[PDB]
């Protein structure tokens with residue numbers, strides 16, 4: 678019946694307005710306050726559109742949930758993505774949240790528009806990315822991670838689909854859907870991540886910032902070696918016992934291989950932190 682702002686900075690959920698938006702007409706705030714340009718992605722969650730605002734003329738991405746809130750928990754769960762994104766705050770290697778609102782039980786998240794995901798970029802090039810690119814992405818994403826970890830946040834979904842290219846070879850970590858704030862158990866908490874990137878200790882319910890380091894580890898491995906990660910089975914196990922698969926790891930320089938072994942350390946207690954990684958010689962200007 679009317680669009681209401683979703684934020685956790687202030688309590689009072691307030692209604693939106695926009696040039697283009699006259700509440701009289703039947704069309705939603707979305708339909709009416711934006712120029713829908715194309716579909717960036719879609720799935721069980723809902724849809725992401727590339728849009729141009731009719732408020733500022735700028736391009737953004739807007740995620741829209743698929744069906745109206747099923748109940749109070751379903752609402753609180755979806756609304757919590759906004760809380761997660763807000764806890765991150767502004768950082769040059771984190772996707773920026775513009776605003777978010779709800780209307781008719783549907784949640785909308787409006788982010789800045791970035792370049793392609795790392796997943797698309799690798800897919801388009803169809804081969805292992807050059808080592809010089811990898812180091813830049815490895816470094817941007819560690820900076821993002823160290824920003825999160827310093828605040829007791831764990832992304833839990835580090836992977837190429839959630840890393841987005843920016844100008845001149847930089848990138849941004851985004852999509853804080855599964856982000857959790859450590860020390861707080863719930864709720865609901867720890868929705869399940871992609872098993873291809875799962876730190877081994879998560880299997881037995883051991884969660885911590887170390888999980889993200891391991892995920893970025895496989896993420897860098899995948900893009901560096903044009904390698905598909907296994908969902909399960911012996912192959913999944915082989916990546917989680919310390920050593921590296923020697924097949925596609927061939928091209929890696931000594932320095933890259935060295936850093937990946939640090940990140941893929943099975944024991945979270947012994948696994949390098951993002952801070953420690955960033956203080957290694959190979960990873961600072």
Ligand SMILES: CCOc1cc2ncc(C#N)c(Nc3ccc(F)c(Cl)c3)c2cc1NC(=O)/C=C/CN(C)C
Pocket residue numbers: 717718719725738739740772786787788789790791792793794797841851852
């Ligand atoms: C050319 C540029 O393409 C994209 C640019 C993006 N910029 C910012 C954000 C952000 N944030 C994106 N995703 C996104 C995540 C979660 C959110 F909640 C919100 Cl609002 C937005 C983006 C997604 C893009 N495109 C794709 O997702 C590509 C998918 C390929 N296929 C596997 C479907």
